Design a protein around this ligand. Structure first.
Ligand code: EDT
Length: 67
């Protein structure tokens, strides 16, 4: 597809706090996250916060897929 297409985003419907751990992504409810891998692994997805531009793994269950 055209370069830049295929983006998938989710909306945080619960907040998630990484703590002192750069592998995990923090976000507040309402933040949008662009997925950067094709599937969740063991219930964890990986993406980038629209608000903070940080990246990391998070519980997929804390979000819902935007359509
Ligand atoms: O529709 C809204 O008011 C805001 N939507 C924008 C995108 N919507 C559009 C819609 O529902 O008509 C799709 C979605 O929430 O998946 C985001 C949200 O609920 O936080």
């Amino acid at each position: 597809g055209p370069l830049g297409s295929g983006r998938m985003r989710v909306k945080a419907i619960f907040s998630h706090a990484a703590g002192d751990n750069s592998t995990l992504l923090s976000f507040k409810e309402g933040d949008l996250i662009t997925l950067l891998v094709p599937e969740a692994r063991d219930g964890w997805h990986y993406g980038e916060s629209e608000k903070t531009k940080m990246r990391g793994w998070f519980p997929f269950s804390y979000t819902r897929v935007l359509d």
